[PDB]
């Protein structure tokens, strides 16, 4: 999928950050207990471990990481 703007409305399936590290799911609490999740941001498309922009950060989609000593990181979504 592609992103346009900040990718507020991005609903692709990228699952690794721009460093290629594997996301964590939005519905897991390991390795990280998330502040953003499907519970809380029901309208945010927080599916699977996919990159999303819940907070509309000018830096584009990110996800929680399966690196325990690294809480999140941004994903590299090509523009739209």
Binding interface with ligand AMH (CB under 6 A)? 35-36, 55, 57, 62, 72
Task: Please tell me the distance from the alpha carbon of residue 34 to that of residue 53, in angstroms, as a whole number.
Answer: 14
CB of 23 to ligand AMH, least distance (A): 12
33 is in an annotated binding site: no
Task: Please tell me the distance from the alpha carbon of residue 42 to that of residue 80, in angstroms, as a whole number.
Answer: 24
Give the residue closest to ligand AMH by C-beta.
Answer: 35
76 is in an annotated binding site: no
Angle ∠(8,10,15) on CA atoms, nearest 5: 120
Task: Please tell me the distance from the alpha carbon of residue 68 to that of residue 80, in angstroms, as a whole number.
Answer: 32
Residue 53, token pair as written in the block = 């922009």
57 is in an annotated binding site: yes
CB of 53 to ligand AMH, least distance (A): 8
CB of 62 to ligand AMH, least distance (A): 6
Q: Please state the residue numbers annotated as binding site for L-lysine.
A: 35, 57, 71
| Residues flagged as binding site | 35, 57, 71
């Amino acid at each position: 999928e592609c992103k346009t703007g900040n990718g507020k409305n991005y609903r692709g399936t990228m699952s690794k950050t721009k460093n290629g590290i594997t996301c964590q799911k939005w519905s897991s609490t390991s390795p990280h207990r998330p502040r953003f999740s499907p519970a809380t941001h029901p309208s945010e498309g927080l599916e699977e471990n996919y990159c999303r922009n819940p907070d509309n950060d000018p830096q584009g989609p990110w996800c929680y990481t399966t690196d325990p000593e690294k809480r999140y990181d941004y994903c590299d979504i090509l523009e739209c």
